[PDB]
Design a protein around this ligand. Structure first.
Ligand SMILES: *[C@@H]1O[C@H](CO)[C@@H](O)[C@H](O)[C@H]1NC(C)=O
Lengths: 49, 37
């Protein structure tokens, strides 16, 4: 164990770190951004996302 | 309720051939009419 002090250490302050590990190009995604959807117009040269 | 099973008559090992059941789909992809390796 290390001596976690309020301010005596000055440096070496605690750091709460969280690491995210995404996995891409896989089975249908469960997590996505807040972007919304639109129609599915067919028989037309359209961009798709 | 667990207990050692008595009358555990030891038996010789048994062997067989794997034949033609040893694979799976490596990825979530619908590659069709392809000879992918
Ligand atoms: C059964 O035998 C095994 C192996 O010696 C032992 O670990 C286990 O505790 C025994 N169970 C009982 C209920 O005596």
């Amino acid at each position: 164990s290390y001596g976690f002090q309020p301010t005596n250490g000055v440096g070496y302050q605690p750091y709460r770190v969280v690491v995210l590990s995404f996995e891409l190009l896989h089975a249908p995604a469960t997590v996505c951004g807040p972007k919304k959807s639109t129609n599915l117009v067919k028989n037309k040269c359209v961009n798709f996302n | 309720q667990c207990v050692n099973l008595t009358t555990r008559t030891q038996l010789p090992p048994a062997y067989t051939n794997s034949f033609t059941r040893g694979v799976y789909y490596p990825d979530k992809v619908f590659r069709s009419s392809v000879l992918h390796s």
